[PDB]
């Protein structure tokens, strides 16, 4: 995992810094960012009204 | 005194009024009378104002009748008035049928 993350040009640790739109502040602790797989379930609220 | 309606938080009514629940009811009565008097006043004077014509279109011809209507519509509901009367505590409650200090 670490070898691939290295060879992709990334922080070898999964962490990074981040910024806020509105204040430009650098969130003093490093936040985690990534890519994940995501599903939508069938309880759509249009039929709960 | 202006109210600018909010939600009320009370212990003062335990000072002037002996019981919470009786306090609620007497506020209810005062609110009732205040509402009745305002509703009759509004209905009489407005029907006098619009006695000339009652059609759908004709009511909006000057925008000022609507303006006064929404001004009074900008006034707090009766219960707020009665509550404010008890923080000012201008009223006194006693055995059945307590009434304002209007005399």
């Amino acid at each position: 995992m670490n070898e691939w993350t290295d060879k992709a040009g990334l922080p070898r640790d999964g962490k990074t810094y981040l910024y806020d739109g509105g204040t430009g502040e650098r969130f003093d602790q490093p936040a985690t960012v990534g890519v994940t797989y995501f599903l939508k379930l069938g309880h759509m609220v249009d039929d709960k009204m | 005194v202006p109210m600018d309606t909010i939600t009320r938080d009370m212990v003062r009514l335990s000072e002037d009024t002996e019981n919470v629940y009786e306090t609620v009811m007497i506020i209810a009565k005062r609110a009732n009378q205040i509402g009745q008097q305002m509703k009759q006043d509004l209905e009489k004077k407005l029907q006098d104002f619009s006695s000339s014509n009652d059609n759908l279109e004709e009511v909006f011809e000057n925008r000022e009748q609507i303006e006064i209507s929404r001004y009074y519509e900008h006034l707090p509901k009766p219960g707020l008035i009665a509550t404010a009367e008890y923080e000012q505590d201008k009223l006194y409650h006693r055995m059945p049928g307590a009434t304002s200090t209007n005399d």
Binding site: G21, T23, G24 | -
Partner: protein, 231 residues
């Protein structure tokens, strides 16, 4: 005293990507400048896109045309993505008539920008794959706007039993940068580097958009500094 900068430099690697640098600055002040610019740039600019479609031989968003490899849904969905450009001012709204009638693969630039008022930037996008024999007639409406609008609001324009309204993403910007770092002389401080990047669609060079954002922001502060009406 007020350490005023004068160094505003442009470098412009391409017609669409540009850099800018601001030099020299008083501390803690460029972050303010740049973050204000980033917000306004990336929020509130103006662009164009397509809204309405009338296909011949199809009546609703779930049909299919004989001899065309995609649904009508995917035609509309990818037509959503085609970024445009003006060549003339004052072009309000436009209607187009495409008649593809040959054994082809129907692509973006294949759209004849046949109206003199307007053009297409991205020409090399694949709308659809026809067969050897499909005949297709399409009619477009392109219009200007801001931010984002969904479909059902665009139900305003008179479907006439055929017209299909589509989503429309109007924003003309794609990416923005600012960064800051100190620069110094020995023993004497308070030099600041602001380095900024603008990446657009090509519908307008970075300079015009940057100028417009600043014009709006100054237009806001103008009233809020001088006029002082009192309660």
């Amino acid at each position: 005293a007020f350490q005023k900068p004068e160094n505003v430099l442009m470098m412009e690697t391409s017609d669409s990507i540009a850099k800018f640098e601001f030099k020299p600055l008083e501390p803690g002040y460029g972050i303010t400048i740049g973050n204000a610019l980033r917000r306004i740039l990336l929020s509130s600019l103006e662009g164009f896109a397509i809204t309405a479609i009338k296909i011949e031989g199809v009546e609703h968003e779930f049909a299919t045309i004989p001899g065309v490899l995609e649904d009508v849904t995917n035609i509309i969905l990818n037509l959503k993505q085609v970024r445009f450009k003006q060549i003339v001012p004052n072009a309000d709204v436009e209607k187009a008539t495409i008649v593809i009638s040959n054994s082809e693969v129907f692509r973006a630039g294949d759209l004849n920008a046949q109206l003199s008022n307007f053009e297409v930037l991205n020409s090399n996008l694949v709308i659809c794959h026809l067969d050897k024999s499909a005949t297709l007639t399409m009619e477009f409406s392109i219009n200007k706007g801001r931010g984002y609008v969904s479909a059902e609001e665009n139900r305003a324009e008179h479907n006439e039993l055929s017209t299909i309204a589509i989503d429309s993403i109007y924003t003309p910007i794609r990416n923005v940068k600012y960064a800051v770092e100190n620069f110094r002389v020995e023993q004497k401080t308070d030099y600041e580097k602001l380095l900024m990047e603008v990446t657009t669609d090509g519908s307008i060079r970075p300079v015009d958009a940057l100028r417009e954002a600043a014009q709006i922001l100054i237009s806001h502060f103008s009233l809020f500094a001088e006029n002082k009406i009192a309660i």
